């Protein structure tokens with residue numbers, strides 16, 4: 100099974116990934132995890148981060164250019180992902196393709212039915228061949244650029260409501276990981 104944990108910066112995704120990992124292992128399931136972006140490994144990722152800090156000229160001024168970089172990072176891990184899916188009962192990704200759809204649409208003031216979110220699916224899933232996750236879990240919290248972070252949180256909820264890329268669950272800060280694992284497990 101392939102699961103992506105999503106949410107805005109500060110939501111506490113990593114804590115949820117660890118909680119869930121423990122829950123799955125307590126249920127007798129092997130688990131592997133991977134986090135995106137792969138800063139320090141993927142040059143496309145590193146350039147994107149650097150661009151967010153003002154390097155690389157006008158790069159960060161293009162939503163679609165930034166999206167393309169994070170897509171190339173994930174696409175570089177496509178075989179690692181498929182490997183882990185063969186080797187483990189459950190694979191948990193701390194961010195995945197929906198991160199690109201939510202941040203891109205939020206930046207363009209589009210909704211989850213808009214052009215950027217559709218483009219992300221065509222490029223990452225169809226073109227670059229990334230596997231669709233069995234489940235996408237949105238961690239939605241009251242609080243972790245604030246206006247943008249809040250709008251991204253909302254677009255994320257819209258992706259969950261529409262079933263963008265597959266089935267989702269929306270969870271809060273105090274979700275019971277034992278219960279959540281039983282829900283996610285086939």
Ligand SMILES: N#Cc1c(-c2ccc(C(=O)O)cc2)c2c([nH]c1=O)-c1cccc(-c3cn[nH]c3)c1CC2
Nearest residue numbers: 108135136159162165166169194198199202203206
């Ligand atoms: N993974 C991922 C991922 C991320 C992302 C990475 C790390 C964190 C973190 O460390 O919390 C948070 C988010 C982003 C985008 N796309 C992705 O795929 C994306 C997509 C379009 C535009 C922009 C943008 C350009 N100016 N402002 C925003 C972005 C930036 C954020």
Ligand SMILES: [Mg+2]
Nearest residue numbers: 206207208209
């Ligand atoms: Mg627009």
